[PDB]
Amino acid sequence: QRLHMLQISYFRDPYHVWYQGNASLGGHLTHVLEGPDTNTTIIQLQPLQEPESWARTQSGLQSYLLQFHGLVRLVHQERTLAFPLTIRCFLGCELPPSRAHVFFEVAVNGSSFVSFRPERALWQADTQVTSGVVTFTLQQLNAYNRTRYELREFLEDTCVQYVQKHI
Ligand SMILES: CCCCCCCCCCCCCCCC
Ligand SMILES: *[C@@H]1O[C@H](CO)[C@@H](O)[C@H](O)[C@H]1NC(C)=O
Ligand SMILES: *[C@@H]1O[C@H](CO)[C@@H](O)[C@H](O)[C@H]1NC(C)=O
Ligand SMILES: *[C@@H]1O[C@H](CO)[C@@H](O)[C@H](O)[C@H]1NC(C)=O
Ligand SMILES: CCCCCCCCCC
Ligand SMILES: CCCCCC
């Protein structure tokens, strides 16, 4: 009983991005993300959520993408960051038949970059390369409740409750 979410972001430059993503519930594809930042398709393949509730979830995902893009632009603006690049975000929750296991792992240009430590709602480097980019990204992720305790709540409560409601 799990929900997994995958987001791949292709940045031609800091300001133009193409998204490709999907989610699966119990190992079955349930959602698809596709399109440029200006017009991104976000679809549930199965009518799991009622329309008013889905429109709420769709809106939240759109706002996430805008904040994600904002952070990538800020890293570019403050550190040396070379484009084009790809970012992979892999996150979700898994319910043992006890405590849920949740995760959020980020790769850049196919290499491990940062990941979320839910035990303390903190981000760590997954690379051994000491890097102004990695250091600056961590400083931003670890400075805001949105990417700390609020993200832990999304993974530990929202995603788990989605699995509990729909598997
Ligand atoms: C240069 C690589 C960037 C890696 C970005 C990781 C994104 C993790 C979630 C970010 C979206 C939440 C809002 C961020 C607000 C600062
Ligand atoms: C997303 O789709 C890709 C394409 O096959 C697949 O490899 C991956 O497992 C999927 N992930 C999720 C969370 O649905
Ligand atoms: C946005 O994308 C959808 C799906 O590709 C398309 O139907 C719609 O016309 C697009 N809107 C534009 C290009 O303004
Ligand atoms: C990512 O890879 C592309 C080509 O593979 C390169 O042009 C770009 O500079 C790379 N960016 C980073 C941050 O490694
Ligand atoms: C359709 C799946 C899109 C990728 C997952 C986005 C998760 C954002 C969590 C805040
Ligand atoms: C793609 C989002 C699925 C639902 C997350 C609670």
Author numbering: 9 to 105, 108 to 177
Sentences from the paper on this structure:
EPCR is a transmembrane MHC class I-like glycoprotein primarily abundant in the vasculature of large vessels, but present in numerous cell types. Since its identification, EPCR has been mainly known for its role in accelerating the generation of the anticoagulant activated protein C (APC) and favoring its cytoprotective properties. Structurally, EPCR shares a notable degree of homology with the CD1 family of receptors, including the presence of a central and extended hydrophobic cavity suitable for lipid antigens, flanked by two alpha helices lying on top of a beta sheet. The presence of a lipid bound to EPCR is key for its biological functions.
In the delipidated EPCR structure, the electron density for the Arg156 side chain is absent, which suggests high flexibility (elevated B-factors) and conformational disorder. Moreover, and in line with the lipid dependency of EPCR, surface plasmon resonance studies showed that loading of delipidated EPCR, whose interaction with protein C/APC is compromised, with PC restored its binding ability.
